[PDB]
Amino acid sequence: QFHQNNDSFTLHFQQRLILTHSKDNPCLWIGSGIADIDMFRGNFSIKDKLQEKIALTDAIVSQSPDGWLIHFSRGSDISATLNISADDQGRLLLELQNDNLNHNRIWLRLAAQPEDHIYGCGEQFSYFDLRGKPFPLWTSEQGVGRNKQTYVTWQADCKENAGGDYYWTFFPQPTFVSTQKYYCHVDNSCYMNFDFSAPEYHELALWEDKATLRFECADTYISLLEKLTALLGRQPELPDWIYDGVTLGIQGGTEVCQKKLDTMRNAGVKVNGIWAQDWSGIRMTSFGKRVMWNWKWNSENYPQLDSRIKQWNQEGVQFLAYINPYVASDKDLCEEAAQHGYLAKDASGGDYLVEFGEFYGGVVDLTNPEAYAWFKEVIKKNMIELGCGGWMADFGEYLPTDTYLHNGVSAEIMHNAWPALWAKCNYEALEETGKLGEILFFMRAGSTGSQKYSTMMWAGNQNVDWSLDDGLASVVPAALSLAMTGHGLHHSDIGGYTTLFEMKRSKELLLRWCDFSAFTPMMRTHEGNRPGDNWQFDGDAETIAHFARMTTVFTTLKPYLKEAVALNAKSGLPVMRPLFLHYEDDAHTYTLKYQYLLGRDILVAPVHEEGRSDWTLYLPEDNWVHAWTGEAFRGGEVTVNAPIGKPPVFYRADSEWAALFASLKSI
Numbered sequence: 314q315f316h317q318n319n320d321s322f323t324l325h326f327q328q329r330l331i332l333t334h335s336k337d338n339p340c341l342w343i344g345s346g347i348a349d350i351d352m353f354r355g356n357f358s359i360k361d362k363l364q365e366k367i368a369l370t371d372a373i374v375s376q377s378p379d380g381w382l383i384h385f386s387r388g389s390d391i392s393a394t395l396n397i398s399a400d401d402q403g404r405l406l407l408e409l410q411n412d413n414l415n416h417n418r419i420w421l422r423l424a425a426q427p428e429d430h431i432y433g434c435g436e437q438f439s440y441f442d443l444r445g446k447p448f449p450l451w452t453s454e455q456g457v458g459r460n461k462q463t464y465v466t467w468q469a470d471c472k473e474n475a476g477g478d479y480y481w482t483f484f485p486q487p488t489f490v491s492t493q494k495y496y497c498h499v500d501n502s503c504y505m506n507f508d509f510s511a512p513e514y515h516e517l518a519l520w521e522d523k524a525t526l527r528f529e530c531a532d533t534y535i536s537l538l539e540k541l542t543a544l545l546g547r548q549p550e551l552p553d554w555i556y557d558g559v560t561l562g563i564q565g566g567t568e569v570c571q572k573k574l575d576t577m578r579n580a581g582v583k584v585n586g587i588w589a590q591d592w593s594g595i596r597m598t599s600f601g602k603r604v605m606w607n608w609k610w611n612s613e614n615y616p617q618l619d620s621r622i623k624q625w626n627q628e629g630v631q632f633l634a635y636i637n638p639y640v641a642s643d644k645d646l647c648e649e650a651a652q653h654g655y656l657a658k659d660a661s662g663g664d665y666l667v668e669f670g671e672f673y674g675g676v677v678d679l680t681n682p683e684a685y686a687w688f689k690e691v692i693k694k695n696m697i698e699l700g701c702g703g704w705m706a707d708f709g710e711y712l713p714t715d716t717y718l719h720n721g722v723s724a725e726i727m728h729n730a731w732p733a734l735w736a737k738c739n740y741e742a743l744e745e746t747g748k749l750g751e752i753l754f755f756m757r758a759g760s761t762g763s764q765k766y767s768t769m770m771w772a773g774n775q776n777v778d779w780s781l782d783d784g785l786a787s788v789v790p791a792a793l794s795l796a797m798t799g800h801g802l803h804h805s806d807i808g809g810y811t812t813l814f815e816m817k818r819s820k821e822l823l824l825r826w827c828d829f830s831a832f833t834p835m836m837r838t839h840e841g842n843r844p845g846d847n848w849q850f851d852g853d854a855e856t857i858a859h860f861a862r863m864t865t866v867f868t869t870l871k872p873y874l875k876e877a878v879a880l881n882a883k884s885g886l887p888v889m890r891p892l893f894l895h896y897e898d899d900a901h902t903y904t905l906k907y908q909y910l911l912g913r914d915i916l917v918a919p920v921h922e923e924g925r926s927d928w929t930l931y932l933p934e935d936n937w938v939h940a941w942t943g944e945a946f947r948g949g950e951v952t953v954n955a956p957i958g959k960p961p962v963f964y965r966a967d968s969e970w971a972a973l974f975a976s977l978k979s980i
């Protein structure tokens with residue numbers, strides 16, 4: 314539905330009002346800015362020197378039988394064209410192209426209603442409903458603290474501009490869902506700011522001279538996500554062994570791994586894996602114990618690993634490793650990359666050395682098909698053929714904007730696109746070895762296409778604290794925001810990661826986090842950056858026993874989880890779901906941030922505060938059974954006892970899975 318008067322028009326798409334334009338209230342501005350983008354250790358400082366911002370108030374429409382073409386102008390020397398058409402699947406397609414490259418800013422307004430909620434924009438840690446705020450979309454480090462009013466954030470800012478803020482994330486994406494039951498996906502990867510704060514419109518700011526946007530509607534959110542994932546990609550099914558226990562994050566070598574494994578197994582903990590990020594060596598820095606970034610098994614630290622991997626596998630234990638797409642400048646791979654011209658370049662034509670925190674690395678130029686192939690062979694040869702069942706595929710958010718890439722695309726454009734590219738490299742390693750569905754890699758950074766190429770997201774680095782913006786809590790909006798952006802497999806470090814400034818992980822925080830992760834599709838621990846300052850999974854007999862209990866819980870859910878994972882693969886129906894996917898008529902479910910459905914039938918509200926013996930949450934109208942007592946409940950706000958090991962989890966009494974669920978209160 315396109316309606317027009319002289320310099321005035323509206324566009325409806327399946328009855329959603331998308332655009333309105335008039336001389337008085339334009340939908341389009343263009344102009345120009347000079348980007349001053351600086352990075353220190355992945356923490357970006359983005360300044361614009363805005364030169365112009367010009368409202369294109371004149372619009373001349375011409376019509377094809379396949380669309381409308383709108384010439385916008387403000388005099389002869391300022392103009393842009395908007396083509397409105399349908400793409401090959403009938404999605405609404407807007408193509409914008411400014412007059413010339415000098416006009417490298419776009420602001421486009423979309424119509425909205427005050428009541429609309431907005432979800433998505435990738436992986437968001439402070440907000441799930443985005444309505445009422447702007448979100449800059451620039452992949453970076455996620456922040457330490459992430460709130461200017463908390464102390465840790467202030468410390469991290471002083472120390473290295475590292476505290477961040479509510480919108481910082483390693484997986485921003487220019488994709489959102491409206492409670493008008495449509496999504497909007499922007500194909501650009503330039504800097505963008507999605508402004509959701511005006512009651513009557515959404516404003517999308519693009520730092521480019523052109524923009525493509527697609528929209529699709531549906532009658533339910535589930536169908537909408539089916540459509541969104543038809544566009545962006547659907548993840549494979551998880552390997553069957555992911556459901557079989559906890560993956561133990563261990564460092565310090567083979568014997569330590571063995572000793573800890575045995576401690577856990579012998580106490581009855583269900584262990585499916587050992588994840589040893591230091592498989593390649595350790596680098597000590599002031600931040601803490603980091604990995605040596607040269608992607609080859611270090612047999613001095615991990616003697617007999619080649620054989621031990623298989624002995625572990627014989628007992629149902631996978632070995633997981635660590636790789637990122639950078640290479641330590643003081644090691645072999647970086648040298649080999651340098652010799653073949655496989656590294657991103659600086660303006661002088663040298664290889665760009667990035668400062669990563671008291672060491673330097675090259676950036677493997679994944680835009681060079683040869684470097685891409687070579688790096689994929691590194692994975693295949695040095696990890697898959699070694700016998701890894703999986704790995705952390707980390708980073709992807711750190712490309713500096715003054716690197717020069719083999720494909721000739723500006724680093725200011727390639728920066729945001731990097732994660733998906735890295736994801737694809739991993740995905741293809743698996744695909745080329747027949748290991749999709751068998752090997753599992755997990756990623757932190759993401760971008761458009763991570764929905765196809767990342768077999769699992771993890772929530773990156775939480776503080777080992779109970780903060781809303783960077784603690785246990787924040788993982789839930791991260792998971793739900795991703796679900797709404799088309800990625801339905803999400804987990805977090807059991808216990809958090811970031812151990813700085815007197816933050817140290819308590820036993821209590823370890824156990825609460827364990828209770829949370831038992832109700833997600835993957836259980837995996839982390840030592841954190843300072844292992845010896847954090848409570849760990851084997852800190853005492855009670856911790857071990859808690860793990861044996863909650864791993865038993867997790868493994869009981871295996872068939873349920875697997876079905877939910879199948880559904881994710883088949884139709885983009887995410888494993889951790891916002892309540893409104895199934896309780897659409899309940900207005901209260903649209904504003905929940907810290908509870909989710911695990912599958913259709915289990916409602917989870919993790920305790921995210923220290924010192925609680927009870928917990929308050931919302932049950933939508935259904936017949937619920939408390940998992941630990943069998944107690945029946947109906948909808949409305951409820952407070953339950955929530956000691957450690959009995960997280961606030963409820964299941965639908967009418968679930969075909971009810972007898973499985975009913976066995977939980979007997980563990």
Ligand SMILES: O=[N+]([O-])c1ccc(O[C@H]2O[C@H](CS(=O)(=O)O)[C@@H](O)[C@H](O)[C@H]2O)cc1
Pocket residue numbers: 354355454590602603604605669670707757773774810839
């Ligand atoms: O920018 N930094 O310096 C920075 C440091 C550590 C970061 O953590 C990431 O990297 C760690 C490995 S390492 O310390 O960089 O070798 C892994 O243990 C974490 O799980 C992962 O999220 C991420 C970034």
Ligand SMILES: [Ca+2]
Pocket residue numbers: 317318319
């Ligand atoms: Ca008219």
Ligand SMILES: [Ca+2]
Pocket residue numbers: 455456457458774775776783811
């Ligand atoms: Ca953080």
